[PDB]
C-alpha cells in the first residue's frame, strides 16, 4: 500500500536511495537514430534521446526523425507521446507529428522562459489574427481561443494540413506554475490540471496519443504520465493496494529514458497519486475541493 510506503520512505529519509534504485534498474536501449550527425540539431539535450524501438517517426521520406517517444501502457490502455520542447527548427516537425499521430491534445508543462533561459520555442500563435505557417511541413496553425486560469491556460488551436485542407481542433493544456526549482508544495493544482486534460477527451482511445512535453520531455512529462496511469490502474481494478508506482515508472522507462528526473519528483508523484486516489475510490466531492484549493480564477 503506497501511503504506508510513502510514510516509511519519508520516516527513513530514503527518497534519494529509492530513486537511485530506479535509475539503476531502468532499461537501456539504443538510440542510434537520435545520435546520427544529421539529427544533432533536432535534439535539444544531448543526454535526452528517444530509444529507437519506441520513437515516433515522421511520415516523410527526407528525415523521419523527431525527439519523441511512444509510451504505450498496455494494462492501463493509455498511450502518451513524450517529446522535448520544440526547437526553432523543429516546430514544423512537432505539428507534423501531432497531425500524423492524430493527437487531440498537447500538454505543455513548462514556460517558454524559465530560470532566465529559453526552454522551448514559441511553437503556437499568441494572437488569433497572427496565424503560423510551417513551410517545411506545410501546416497552418491558428489560435481559436484561450482560457487563462491562475495555474494553467487552455487553448483551442486549429491545425490545417495545407496539402489536403483538412483541419482539426487541437487542445493545448499549458501548466504555467510549475516552480523554477523543486516540485509543487501541494499536488492539488497538478491533479486539477490532469483532470482538466482528462475531461477534454484528449487522453481517450478514440484519439491519437496525447503529446506531452516540458523542456526535455522526461521530468515533469514523466510525472504527469506516471500519475495518470497509476490513477487509471487503480480505477480499473479498484485496488489502491495492487498499484506499484515504482513498477509503473520502470515500465514507462522501457519507452523513454529519464522519466522522473529527481527524487523530489518521485516523492511528488506518490503524493499526487495518493491524493488523486481519493476521487478514484468514491469521494467524488474531492475534485471540487481541488478547484477551490488550486485557486484557479484570476
Amino acid at each position: 500500500e503506497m501511503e504506508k510506503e510513502f510514510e516509511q520512505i519519508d520516516k527513513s529519509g530514503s527518497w534519494a536511495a529509492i530513486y537511485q534504485d530506479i535509475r539503476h534498474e531502468a532499461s537501456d536501449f539504443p538510440c542510434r537514430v537520435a545520435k546520427l550527425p544529421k539529427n544533432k540539431n533536432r535534439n535539444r539535450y544531448r543526454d535526452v534521446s528517444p530509444f529507437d524501438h519506441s520513437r515516433i517517426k515522421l511520415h516523410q521520406e527526407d528525415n523521419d526523425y523527431i525527439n519523441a517517444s511512444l509510451i504505450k501502457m498496455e494494462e492501463a490502455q493509455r498511450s502518451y507521446i513524450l517529446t522535448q520542447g520544440p526547437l526553432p527548427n523543429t516546430c514544423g516537425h512537432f505539428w507534423e507529428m501531432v497531425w500524423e499521430q492524430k493527437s487531440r491534445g498537447v500538454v505543455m508543462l513548462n514556460r517558454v522562459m524559465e530560470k532566465g533561459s529559453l526552454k522551448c520555442a514559441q511553437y503556437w500563435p499568441q494572437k488569433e489574427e497572427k496565424e503560423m505557417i510551417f513551410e517545411d511541413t506545410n501546416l497552418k496553425l491558428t489560435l481559436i481561443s484561450e482560457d487563462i486560469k491562475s495555474y494553467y491556460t487552455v487553448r483551442q488551436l486549429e491545425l490545417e494540413n495545407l496539402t489536403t485542407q483538412e483541419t482539426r481542433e487541437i487542445l493545448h493544456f499549458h501548466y504555467t506554475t510549475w516552480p523554477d526549482f523543486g516540485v509543487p508544495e501541494s499536488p492539488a493544482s497538478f491533479l486539477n490540471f490532469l483532470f482538466k486534460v482528462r475531461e477534454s477527451g484528449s487522453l481517450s482511445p478514440e484519439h491519437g496519443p496525447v503529446v506531452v512535453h516540458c523542456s526535455a520531455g522526461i521530468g515533469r512529462s514523466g510525472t504527469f504520465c506516471l500519475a495518470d496511469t497509476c490513477l487509471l490502474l487503480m480505477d480499473k481494478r479498484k485496488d489502491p493496494s495492487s498499484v506499484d508506482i515504482k513498477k509503473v515508472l520502470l515500465e514507462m522507462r522501457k519507452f523513454r529514458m529519464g522519466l522522473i528526473q529527481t527524487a523530489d519528483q518521485l516523492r511528488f508523484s506518490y503524493l499526487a497519486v495518493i491524493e488523486g486516489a481519493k476521487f478514484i475510490m468514491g469521494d467524488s466531492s474531492v475534485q471540487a475541493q481541488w478547484k477551490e484549493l488550486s485557486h484557479e480564477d484570476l
Side-chain angles (χ1 to χ4, degrees):
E1 203 275 13
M2 71 195 309
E3 193 165 18
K4 272 63 205 164
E5 193 190 337
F6 178 83
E7 289 173 6
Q8 186 264 303
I9 296 165
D10 250 6
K11 175 186 195 93
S12 69
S14 54
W15 285 108
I18 298 303
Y19 176 60
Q20 173 46 41
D21 282 330
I22 290 174
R23 272 194 177 167
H24 195 262
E25 290 162 59
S27 317
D28 194 23
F29 294 111
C31 308
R32 294 189 202 100
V33 181
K35 291 316 249 196
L36 292 171
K38 75 171 182 190
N39 289 332
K40 184 174 174 217
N41 71 181
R42 297 183 176 211
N43 288 316
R44 179 175 286 284
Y45 300 105
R46 72 183 187 91
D47 63 326
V48 187
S49 302
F51 299 137
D52 298 312
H53 80 83
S54 54
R55 78 190 182 91
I56 305 291
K57 299 188 172 90
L58 303 172
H59 300 174
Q60 48 163 291
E61 71 312 318
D62 190 40
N63 185 340
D64 70 8
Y65 179 79
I66 183 173
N67 191 324
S69 303
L70 175 65
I71 302 192
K72 191 167 173 174
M73 303 305 283
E74 193 177 9
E75 191 184 349
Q77 289 293 290
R78 198 153 277 175
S79 285
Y80 319 83
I81 291 166
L82 273 61
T83 192
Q84 67 184 17
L87 287 161
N89 65 317
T90 70
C91 293
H93 305 152
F94 176 89
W95 286 113
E96 180 179 4
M97 175 173 70
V98 166
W99 185 269
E100 290 162 0
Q101 302 302 312
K102 295 188 158 64
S103 314
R104 166 122 175 96
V106 175
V107 175
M108 165 166 189
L109 300 170
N110 66 288
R111 291 172 277 113
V112 164
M113 176 159 293
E114 298 181 328
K115 287 186 198 155
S117 301
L118 296 177
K119 296 295 160 198
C120 187
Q122 189 54 57
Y123 67 86
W124 74 97
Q126 292 182 107
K127 295 173 167 190
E128 287 86 343
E129 71 274 16
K130 278 292 165 235
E131 74 279 6
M132 304 174 69
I133 292 162
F134 299 100
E135 292 189 4
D136 62 341
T137 55
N138 209 39
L139 289 165
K140 188 169 98 174
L141 184 61
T142 308
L143 177 66
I144 298 299
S145 77
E146 114 164 298
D147 182 355
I148 311 193
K149 310 280 206 57
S150 62
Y151 65 101
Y152 77 102
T153 292
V154 187
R155 304 185 183 86
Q156 291 184 228
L157 301 173
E158 167 160 302
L159 185 59
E160 183 176 342
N161 188 329
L162 285 172
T163 295
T164 74
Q165 298 192 332
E166 310 155 71
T167 61
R168 292 169 200 168
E169 184 174 280
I170 310 296
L171 301 175
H172 193 252
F173 295 90
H174 189 175
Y175 195 87
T176 50
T177 53
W178 199 284
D180 271 5
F181 302 87
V183 300
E185 186 160 310
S186 136
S189 8
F190 194 68
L191 288 169
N192 213 46
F193 177 76
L194 166 56
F195 283 89
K196 208 79 187 190
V197 177
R198 277 176 171 204
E199 283 166 7
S200 73
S202 303
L203 288 174
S204 300
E206 68 267 35
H207 304 290
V210 74
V211 179
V212 186
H213 84 84
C214 41
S215 198
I218 60 178
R220 293 177 280 176
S221 296
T223 306
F224 180 85
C225 298
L226 177 63
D228 179 53
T229 282
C230 288
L231 287 174
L232 198 55
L233 291 168
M234 287 174 39
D235 230 5
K236 195 188 274 284
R237 62 223 202 181
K238 297 283 182 172
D239 199 356
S241 328
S242 39
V243 170
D244 188 338
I245 187 163
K246 301 171 301 318
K247 281 182 204 147
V248 175
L249 177 51
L250 288 161
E251 177 69 27
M252 299 195 135
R253 276 190 184 219
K254 300 179 173 181
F255 302 94
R256 185 169 180 87
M257 66 178 60
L259 307 181
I260 310 301
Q261 281 188 283
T262 70
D264 204 13
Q265 276 177 2
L266 187 61
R267 177 176 191 279
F268 180 77
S269 292
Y270 276 71
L271 269 175
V273 176
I274 290 162
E275 184 55 33
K278 274 54 156 159
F279 188 63
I280 279 45
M281 284 305 104
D283 190 352
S284 49
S285 154
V286 91
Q287 194 182 359
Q289 281 155 234
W290 300 333
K291 192 179 303 312
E292 297 292 352
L293 286 160
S294 74
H295 297 109
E296 81 177 28
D297 22 340
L298 191 276

